[PDB]
Amino acid sequence: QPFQQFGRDSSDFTDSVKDPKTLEILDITPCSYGGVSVITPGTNTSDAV
Amino acid sequence: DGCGRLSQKTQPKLEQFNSSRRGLYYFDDIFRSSLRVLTSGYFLPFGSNVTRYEVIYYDNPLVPFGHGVYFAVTEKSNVVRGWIFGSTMDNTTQSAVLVNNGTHIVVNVCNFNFCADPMFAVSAGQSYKSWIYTSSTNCTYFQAFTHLREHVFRNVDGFLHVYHNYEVINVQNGLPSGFSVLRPIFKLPLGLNITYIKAVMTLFSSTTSNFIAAVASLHYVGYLQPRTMLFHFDQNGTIVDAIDCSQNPLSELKCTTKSFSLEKGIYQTSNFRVTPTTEVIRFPNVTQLCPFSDVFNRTKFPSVYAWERMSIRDCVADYAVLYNSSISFSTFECYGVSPTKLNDLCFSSVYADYFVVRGDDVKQIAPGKTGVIADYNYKLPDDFVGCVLAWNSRHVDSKQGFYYRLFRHGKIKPYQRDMSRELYSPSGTPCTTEGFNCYDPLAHYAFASPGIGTGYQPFRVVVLSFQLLNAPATVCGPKQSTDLVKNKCVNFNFNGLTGTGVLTDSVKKFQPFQQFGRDSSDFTDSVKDPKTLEILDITPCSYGGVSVITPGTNTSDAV
Amino acid sequence: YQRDMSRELYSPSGTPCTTEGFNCYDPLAHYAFASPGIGTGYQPFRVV
Amino acid sequence: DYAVLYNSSISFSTFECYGVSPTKLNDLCFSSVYADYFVVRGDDVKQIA
Amino acid sequence: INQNAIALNTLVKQLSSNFGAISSVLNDILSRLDPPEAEVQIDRLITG
Ligand SMILES: *[C@@H]1O[C@H](CO)[C@@H](O[C@@H]2O[C@H](CO)[C@@H](O[C@@H]3O[C@H](CO)[C@@H](O)[C@H](O)[C@@H]3O)[C@H](O)[C@H]2NC(C)=O)[C@H](O)[C@H]1NC(C)=O
Numbered sequence: 112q113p114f115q116q117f118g119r120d121s122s123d124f125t126d127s128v129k130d131p132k133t134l135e136i137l138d139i140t141p142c143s144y145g146g147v148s149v150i151t152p153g154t155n156t157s158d159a160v
Numbered sequence: 161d162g163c164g165r166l167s168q169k170t171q172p173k174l175e176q177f178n179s180s181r182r183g184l185y186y187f188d189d190i191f192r193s194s195l196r197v198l199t200s201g202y203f204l205p206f207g208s209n210v211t212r213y214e215v216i217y218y219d220n221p222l223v224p225f226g227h228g229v230y231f232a233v234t235e236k237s238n239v240v241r242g243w244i245f246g247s248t249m250d251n252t253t254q255s256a257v258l259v260n261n262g263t264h265i266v267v268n269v270c271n272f273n274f275c276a277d278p279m280f281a282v283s284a285g286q287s288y289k290s291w292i293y294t295s296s297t298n299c300t301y302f303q304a305f306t307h308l309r310e311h312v313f314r315n316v317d318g319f320l321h322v323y324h325n326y327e328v329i330n331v332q333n334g335l336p337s338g339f340s341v342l343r344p345i346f347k348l349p350l351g352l353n354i355t356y357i358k359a360v361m362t363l364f365s366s367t368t369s370n371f372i373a374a375v376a377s378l379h380y381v382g383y384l385q386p387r388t389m390l391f392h393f394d395q396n397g398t399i400v401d402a403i404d405c406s407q408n409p410l411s412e413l414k415c416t417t418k419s420f421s422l423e424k425g426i427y428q429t430s431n432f433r434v435t436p437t438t439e440v441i442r443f444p445n446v447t448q449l450c451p452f453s454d455v456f457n458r459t460k461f462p463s464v465y466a467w468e469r470m471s472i473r474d475c476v477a478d479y480a481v482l483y484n485s486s487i488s489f490s491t492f493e494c495y496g497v498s499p500t501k502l503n504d505l506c507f508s509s510v511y512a513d514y515f516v517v518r519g520d521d522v523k524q525i526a527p528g529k530t531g532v533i534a535d536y537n538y539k540l541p542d543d544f545v546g547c548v549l550a551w552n553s554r555h556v557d558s559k560q561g562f563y564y565r566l567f568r569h570g571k572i573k574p575y576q577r578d579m580s581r582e583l584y585s586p587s588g589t590p591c592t593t594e595g596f597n598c599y600d601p602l603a604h605y606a607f608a609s610p611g612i613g614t615g616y617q618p619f620r621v622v623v624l625s626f627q628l629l630n631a632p633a634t635v636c637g638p639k640q641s642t643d644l645v646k647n648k649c650v651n652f653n654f655n656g657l658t659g660t661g662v663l664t665d666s667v668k669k670f671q672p673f674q675q676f677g678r679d680s681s682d683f684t685d686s687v688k689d690p691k692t693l694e695i696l697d698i699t700p701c702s703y704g705g706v707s708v709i710t711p712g713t714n715t716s717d718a719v
Numbered sequence: 720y721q722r723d724m725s726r727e728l729y730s731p732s733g734t735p736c737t738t739e740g741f742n743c744y745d746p747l748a749h750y751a752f753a754s755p756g757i758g759t760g761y762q763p764f765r766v767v
Numbered sequence: 768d769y770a771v772l773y774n775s776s777i778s779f780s781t782f783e784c785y786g787v788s789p790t791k792l793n794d795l796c797f798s799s800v801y802a803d804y805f806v807v808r809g810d811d812v813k814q815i816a
Numbered sequence: 817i818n819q820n821a822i823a824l825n826t827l828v829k830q831l832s833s834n835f836g837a838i839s840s841v842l843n844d845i846l847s848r849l850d851p852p853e854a855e856v857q858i859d860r861l862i863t864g
Pocket residue numbers: 132133
């Protein structure tokens with residue numbers, strides 16, 4: 112709806128915003144989303160992971 | 161353009177309808193989407209005591225504004241187009257007029273002289289006179305039954321908020337039920353004192369005179385009350401449903417869970433049913449002002465090294481009397497107690513100290529600071545409670561004879577006097593005469609050189625210290641008692657002790673020099689009335705537990 | 720944020736007045752600002 | 768020893784301390800003391816905070 | 817039974833502590849301080 116400048120959320124985390132120059136809505140997503148796991152065989156064993 | 165006259169005076173008729181579930185508006189600009197929030201404020205309770213007026217039938221009573229007015233009109237033609245806001249409705253005080261004439265809206269704030277019956281005028285189906293007021297004084301602000309319009313007026317912090325809503329209904333008589341939401345339109349800034357609200361409506365005639373109420377319209381008025389409600393927001397953010405958490409036992413249970421549907425079972429509820437409305441203020445009855453003149457107009461103040469203490473008791477403290485005097489304080493700071501609420505307390509032990517210091521040494525009369533005055537002349541405790549006042553006295557204290565202590569081995573304790581004259585030696589060797597290795601401990605303030613700076617001018621400093629809620633009080637603020645109410649949970653104030661609860665009678669026996677009844681949990685339960693000299697009892701308005709059994713939302717609504 | 724531009728007479732007891740005199744006083748008072756050689760605290764200031 | 772400044776004919780119109788309390792200035796040991804001096808207007812004293 | 821009673825009694829008597837505020841009682845705090853200053857005092861009591 113009009114008269115809106117920010118996009119809120121249930122957790123009060125911004126996700127959308129209106130560009131004041133192009134008058135169109137954008138989207139915000141954190142640079143890191145997924146989870147990363149690393150498997151190692153031990154320090155003495157080797158260093159490859 | 162003048163005003164008409166209405167000699168005929170039909171007695172107004174009053175009827176009582178209800179507001180059903182209407183009178184809701186966006187209370188904030190925060191955009192909420194797909195969630196539920198519980199908010200408290202001033203809203204219209206469901207099923208209220210709405211009042212109806214009709215339009216020889218011409219009813220325009222002076223409606224008190226209160227905390228807000230809910231206005232809804234049902235009409236077939238534009239006959240109601242304005243309102244009057246003011247306090248006394250005369251030219252002595254300013255008033256606001258809001259009418260609809262042209263492009264945007266006609267709103268005016270001015271000193272008006274309203275006639276007996278303000279009204280518009282429409283003749284031959286065209287515009288005519290505007291018989292609302294007859295004079296405009298020095299003023300500033302200027303800016304330019306199928307129909308159902310609802311308006312909510314609120315005035316907070318000098319801002320007049322206006323809400324609008326439109327609906328189409330076909331009802332011959334009676335306020336239609338349903339759910340309505342209002343959206344703000346105006347945020348006009350104007351600082352006024354609104355206490356009464358009036359309405360202006362048009363009248364019709366044939367050519368120029370004999371105005372008659374050919375068209376009748378129905379408008380309703382509602383009073384806003386402090387209520388707690390729960391709101392629901394859709395994805396778009398529009399309000400679709402709400403619950404007033406004071407109507408029925410199911411309401412507070414639904415509000416506590418923060419949901420709109422319930423499951424079969426038994427739940428525990430909170431207190432959302434009783435709110436105190438009556439107040440009980442009690443102060444010991446004495447009437448005598450403090451000797452403000454004896455301390456603020458004393459013709460002689462000593463030096464800082466010879467400050468004197470004065471005791472104050474049996475007063476009715478009133479700082480407002482100092483405004484009438486010709487004293488202008490250049491420094492006024494308070495520690496521990498807020499300056500705003502200084503007139504609603506009861507002091508127990510008031511003492512005053514006065515002396516004379518330099519202009520640049522005023523800052524050193526605060527706790528936890530350093531300086532020659534704070535070290536050898538006058539020091540305050542770290543837990544100081546009171547206020548500090550100071551003013552310039554260049555026209556009374558432009559003389560000689562003032563001194564301060566410059567040399568001293570140790571540092572003085574707080575609230576210590578060191579009136580001494582013996583010689584000082586840096587090495588500690590006793591002296592025999594003034595000269596080498598022997599110097600005068602005191603030094604002069606000058607205060608006699610012409611054209612001295614502001615920092616070297618004499619100043620008069622008065623320090624006030626008092627204790628709160630430890631001993632029976634002797635000095636209290638200017639407040640009047642409102643007798644004693646029994647068997648009701650109310651808001652009492654006994655010598656500056658705000659509380660809430662029922663008070664019926666007490667049989668507890670205690671010892672003298674007691675004003676409050678403590679407990680193992682530091683919760684007040686008994687108190688001594690300073691006027692009747694008898695102990696009372698305090699018990700919270702809510703004591704027991706309440707449980708509500710429900711069969712489910714789909715099943716039924718009986719609980 | 721309230722404006723109180725008024726000129727009516729004031730009475731401490733609340734009794735309505737008819738003229739300035741006993742038990743009736745002018746609510747407003749003067750700033751002087753005209754006496755020569757006034758102090759810094761009595762000088763006019765502009766606040767925004 | 769700040770107490771020697773009392774004997775002089777200097778009257779400070781502004782004395783504020785940050786981090787350390789003025790009361791306990793005589794019971795410490797400073798490690799690196801530096802001093803800066805200049806001249807400003809009377810109304811610009813507050814801007815040195 | 818004694819453990820439950822002791823736990824309840826300790827929970828009841830824990831209100832006497834004022835934590836880092838100036839007083840355990842809440843009535844006097846609102847009777848001498850402005851809300852902007854009273855909020856800080858109330859917050860620590862709520863947290864405790
Ligand atoms: C400053 O804000 C203004 C609005 O207050 C914006 O005005 C817009 O200016 C852009 C400039 O690129 C116009 O777009 C152009 O339109 C036509 C399309 O046929 C063409 O000349 C270009 O290909 C371009 O797309 C846009 O029409 C205009 N909006 C209007 C007139 O309503 C503007 O974005 C801001 N100024 C800048 C970025 O310099």
